[PDB]
Design a protein around this nucleic acid. Structure first.
Length: 602
DNA sequence: GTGAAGGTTCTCTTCAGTATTAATAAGGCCACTGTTAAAACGTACTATATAGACATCTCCACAAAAG
């Protein structure tokens, strides 16, 4: 996770900002909207959902006739390209989501079929429980990936004895068990799977990507319709209401510049770094950044100047800058939108390209990938692709003469396990795995140190700000706020503390748990309990454990994992994934998480 | 004639998914019975511990006959 974003304000005189706003809002965003509409109507759309993959070129092909439609014709080539990238990534995202959800629904539907109680397994096997227990002992002795191997063994073995023995073996977590099945805990575990299947089935009714209408013409024409026309029935009037409540999108889609050299850097005579974008060189924007990021923007000019001095004998494949996003940030107050909103550039950089040693890491990664490509790839334009790839492979050998910082060296036998929990967001154990000894624990309080008071602040603000929103909603007041930025701050403080401890003990890796989807587990567990406690009373079921379900939906385990992954990559510490045990305290969970990831190395 | 804008391709994704070890629970009012200590409280079949109205025997003092 070595890619990170740095940002700066872009400043320019009003006519440059107005011209860019009108390009984005009047042409580029309407084009994106049109591409999303046409792409969702394509005759292959239903087979793209089955593959879960979009064709590499279909957005580019749809955009070609639109580039000369009077609605969209006025744009530079890179703005059409940006619109293509926006639309292509949206569907690459959405088709990947739907594909995995469909696989989850199919997987659990098979499990629901093969989850049979011992009373059902007796009939469906025709064998006594001891007989299927012995047959499961044989099938386990052959399947010795074990879970998948049993799922593979189940499907084509139509022999109901072995098929039931696999069912019995899978019910217990791929192992034998002597103890009797508690019939109500089984019936609950069956009911959980039905709820999960239903909730997956409902999630697969997701909407197609909606776009951003900045005119909101549909709202005003619906208002005129609903006020002067009789609704033909309740369903038309409901559709009218649903439109009238829909909020207006203020801001256009950002521009995306996937060619780092489509940002051209310079220093003006007042000494400020400046940038202009390919196709819009007349609009000079001035960089206004914090000094904590200035060294990156200075590097972008130095990388640009280095390759010009070498007459392009360097490769921009090793430019520290990777891509840019050009974004309008919503301004407070009033004005024309190019005056109200603040133009902001977000630059992706790869942190390894800062140093010379890290650049050598990237160079070999580039060289191996391109040598693979050239070997596997072998038309005129496809031969031109090979020649560009071969030019890259030649030019990445030329050095940028970057700062030298020796790479981190961590001991392979020292690991940090990080236990994640709802009550204690992180707990760490430094384990010496060949010694099987814990070198150090730290609690959440020791990780946060002097910041530990922020953790009670978060809980207190989450309560307070929720209640103030609840009160504000009843007044239709816009003053609705929350603690997300404090929560993000805490997760970043924890990430830095964990990695600093890992560096201090020379740990080779940080071990993080494969939590899965905690929210759908908790939500289906609690619903199965509540349906027994409040039969036929839906509101009673939804009130049951409401605050626990809320707490689990706020638990930011993904954001914390992501923050740890970024900080570890910036110091070259390996991340490993392990299985967090359910037994024990957060300290013991962290220790056994660490040691299991060591033993799982094969 | 260095700089600006614009062109071009990048493959296949029949793969990934489906199993545990699971925590005390996460429901709150209303009324309505029915237990469950455990506190408050009428009164019984007893086990003694006296207090004192009476009955009893004993020791000592007086009239009739004989030398």
């Amino acid at each position: 996770s070595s890619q990170i974003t740095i940002q700066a304000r872009l400043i320019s005189f009003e006519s440059n900002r107005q011209q860019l706003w009108k390009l984005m809002a009047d042409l580029n965003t309407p084009l994106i909207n049109e591409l999303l509409c046409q792409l969702g109507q394509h005759p292959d759309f239903e087979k793209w959902q089955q593959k879960g993959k979009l064709p590499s070129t279909v957005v580019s092909q749809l955009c070609q006739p639109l580039k000369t439609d009077p609605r969209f014709a006025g744009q530079p080539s890179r703005l059409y390209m940006s619109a293509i990238h926006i639309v292509d990534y949206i569907y690459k995202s959405w088709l990947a989501i739907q594909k995995r959800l469909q696989q989850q629904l199919d997987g659990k539907t098979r499990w629901l079929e093969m989850l049979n109680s011992d009373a059902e397994l007796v009939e469906l096997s025709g064998d006594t429980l001891e007989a299927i227990r012995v047959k499961a002992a044989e099938i386990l002795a052959i399947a010795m990936s074990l879970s998948k191997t049993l799922f593979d063994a189940y499907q084509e073995t139509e022999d109901i004895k072995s098929r039931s023995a696999i069912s019995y073996l899978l019910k217990n977590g791929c192992k034998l068990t002597d103890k009797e099945e508690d019939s109500e805990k089984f019936a609950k575990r069956r009911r959980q799977v039905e709820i999960q299947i239903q909730r997956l089935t409902e999630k697969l009714i997701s909407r197609m990507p909606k776009g951003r209408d900045l005119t909101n013409a549909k709202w005003l024409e619906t208002l005129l319709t609903a006020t002067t026309t009789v609704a033909e029935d309740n369903a038309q009037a409901k559709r009218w209401q649903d439109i009238l409540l829909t909020r207006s999108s203020s801001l256009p889609f950002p521009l995306v510049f996937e060619t780092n050299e489509d940002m051209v850097w310079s220093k003006n005579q007042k000494g400020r770094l400046c940038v202009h974008f390919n196709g819009l060189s007349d609009l000079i924007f001035e960089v206004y950044c914090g000094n904590r990021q200035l060294h990156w923007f200075q590097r972008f000019l130095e990388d640009q100047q280095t390759k010009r001095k070498s007459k392009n004998q360097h490769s921009s494949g090793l430019f520290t800058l990777r891509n840019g996003h050009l974004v309008w940030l919503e301004g407070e107050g009033k004005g024309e939108p190019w005056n109200l909103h603040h133009l902001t550039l977000y630059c992706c950089v790869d942190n390894r390209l800062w140093t010379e040693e890290g650049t050598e890491i990237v160079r070999q990664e580039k060289a191996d990938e391109i040598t693979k490509f050239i070997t596997n790839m072998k038309s005129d334009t496809q031969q031109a692709l090979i020649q560009r790839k071969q030019s890259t492979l030649t030019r990445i050998n030329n050095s940028f003469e970057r700062p030298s910082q020796p790479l981190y060296q961590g001991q392979s036998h020292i690991l940090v396990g990080v236990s994640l929990g709802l009550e204690k967001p992180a707990t760490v154990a430094v384990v010496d795995a060949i010694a099987n000894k814990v070198l150090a624990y730290r609690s959440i309080k020791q990780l946060l140190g002097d910041n530990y008071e922020l953790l009670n602040r978060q809980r207190r603000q989450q309560q307070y700000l929720s209640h103030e929103r609840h009160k504000a909603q009843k007044n239709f007041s816009p003053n609705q706020f929350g603690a997300s930025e404090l929560g993000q701050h805490i997760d970043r403080l924890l990430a830095k503390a964990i990695v600093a401890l890992a560096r201090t003990y020379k740990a080779g890796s940080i071990v993080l748990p494969k939590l899965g989807d905690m929210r759908e587990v908790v939500q289906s567990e609690i619903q199965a309990i509540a349906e027994q406690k409040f039969p036929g009373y839906i509101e009673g079921q939804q009130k049951y454990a409401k605050q626990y379900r809320v707490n689990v939906h706020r638990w930011s385990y993904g954001r914390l994992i992501q923050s740890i992954q970024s900080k570890a990559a910036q110091t070259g510490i390996v991340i490993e994934e392990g299985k967090q045990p359910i037994r024990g305290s957060p300290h013991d969970k962290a220790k056994e998480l660490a040691l299991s990831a060591y033993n799982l190395r094969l």
